[PDB]
Amino acid sequence: KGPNGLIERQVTRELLELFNIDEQTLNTQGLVVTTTIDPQAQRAAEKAVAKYLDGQDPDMRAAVVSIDPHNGAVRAYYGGDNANGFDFAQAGLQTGSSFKVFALVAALEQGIGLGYQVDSSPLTVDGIKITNVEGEGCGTCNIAEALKMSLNTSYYRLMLKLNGGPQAVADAAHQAGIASSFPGVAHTLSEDGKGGPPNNGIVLGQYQTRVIDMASAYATLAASGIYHPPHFVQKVVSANGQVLFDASTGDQRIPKAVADNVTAAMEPIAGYSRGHNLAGGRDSAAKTGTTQFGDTTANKDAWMVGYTPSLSTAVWVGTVKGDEPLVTASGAAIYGSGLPSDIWKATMDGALKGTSNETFPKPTEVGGYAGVPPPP
Ligand X SMILES: *C(=O)[C@@H](NC(=O)COc1ccccc1)[C@@H]1N[C@@H](C(=O)O)C(C)(C)S1
- For ligand X, the binding residue among 268, 336, 363, 371 (CB under 6 A) is 336
Closest CB 213 distance from ligand X, rounded Å: 17
Picking from 314, 317, 310, the residue whose alpha carbon sits closest to that of residue 351 is 310
Backbone angles phi, psi at 204, to 5 degrees: -95, 20
- For ligand X, the binding residue among 96, 166, 306, 367 (CB under 6 A) is 96
Contact at 8 Å (CB) between 211 and 218? no
Alpha-carbon distance of 72 to 253, in angstroms, equals: 14
Residue nearest ligand X by beta-carbon distance: 97
Closest CB 269 distance from ligand X, rounded Å: 8
Picking from 105, 167, 115, the residue whose alpha carbon sits closest to that of residue 145 is 115
How many residues in the shown chain lie near ligand X by CB under 6 A?
14
Find all residues with CB under 8 Å of 107, minimum gap 6, and list them. Answer: 113, 116, 143, 158, 161, 162, 367
Does position 297 interact with ligand X (CB under 6 A)? The reply is: yes
- Site pattern 252..291 for ligand X (x: CB under 6 A): ------------------------------------xxx-
Question: Which is nearer to ligand X, 71 or 337 (by Cβ)?
Answer: 337
Contacts (CB under 6 A) with ligand X, residues 28-87 = none
Exactly one of 66, 97, 98, 154 is catalytic; which is it? 97
- For ligand X, the binding residue among 154, 299, 313, 319 (CB under 6 A) is 299
Q: Which stretch, 46-54, 190-198, 237-245, 330-338, contacts ligand X (CB under 6 A)? A: 330-338
Alpha-carbon distance of 83 to 105, in angstroms, equals: 37
Question: Which is nearer to ligand X, 10 or 200 (by Cβ)?
Answer: 200
Does position 97 interact with ligand X (CB under 6 A)? The reply is: yes
Alpha-carbon distance of 206 to 179, in angstroms, equals: 16
Tell me the residue length of the chain: 376
Q: Positive or negative CA dihedral for 55, 97, 109, 186?
A: positive
Picking from 79, 75, 36, 60, the residue whose alpha carbon sits closest to that of residue 315 is 79
- Site pattern 133..172 for ligand X (x: CB under 6 A): x----------------x-x--------------------
Question: Which is nearer to ligand X, 232 or 307 (by Cβ)?
Answer: 307
Find all residues with CB under 8 Å of 222, minimum gap 6, and list them. Answer: 69, 263, 285, 307, 308, 309, 310, 311, 312
Does position 123 interact with ligand X (CB under 6 A)? The reply is: no
Active site residue 97: yes
Interacting residue ranges for ligand X, rule: CB under 6 A:
96-97, 133, 150, 152, 288-290, 292, 297, 299, 335-337
* Positions marked active-site: 97
